[PDB]
């Protein structure tokens with residue numbers, strides 16, 4: 001089943017593609 005993946009968008013730390021999060025909130029690296 002073909003999934004429509006997002007574009008060059010970031011996920012919120014690996015969550016849904018509609019949610020975005022910076023690295024500082026994901027791996028605390030900032």
Ligand SMILES: *[C@H]1O[C@H](CO[C@H]2O[C@H](CO)[C@@H](O[C@@H]3O[C@@H](CO)[C@@H](O)[C@@H](O)[C@@H]3O)[C@H](O)[C@H]2NC(C)=O)[C@H](O)[C@H](O[C@@H]2O[C@H](CO)[C@H](O)[C@H](O)[C@H]2O[C@@H]2O[C@@H](CO)[C@@H](O)[C@@H](O)[C@@H]2O)[C@H]1NC(C)=O
Nearest residue numbers: 002003004005006007008009010011014015016017018019
């Ligand atoms: C963005 O791209 C998503 C899939 O992208 C992958 O493939 C493309 C090209 O094959 C890669 O590069 C993308 O395209 C190039 C040139 O066209 C550049 O613009 C890059 O910046 C761009 O990222 C891309 O990197 C690949 N991704 C990965 C992870 O490898 C989708 O096609 C996305 O489309 C949206 O998807 C969501 C759910 O995933 C919904 O289905 C949206 O409805 C859908 O787009 C909607 O329609 C669009 C055109 O009709 C547009 O109006 C959009 O705003 C709507 O939300 C796609 N999104 C956009 C904005 O292009």
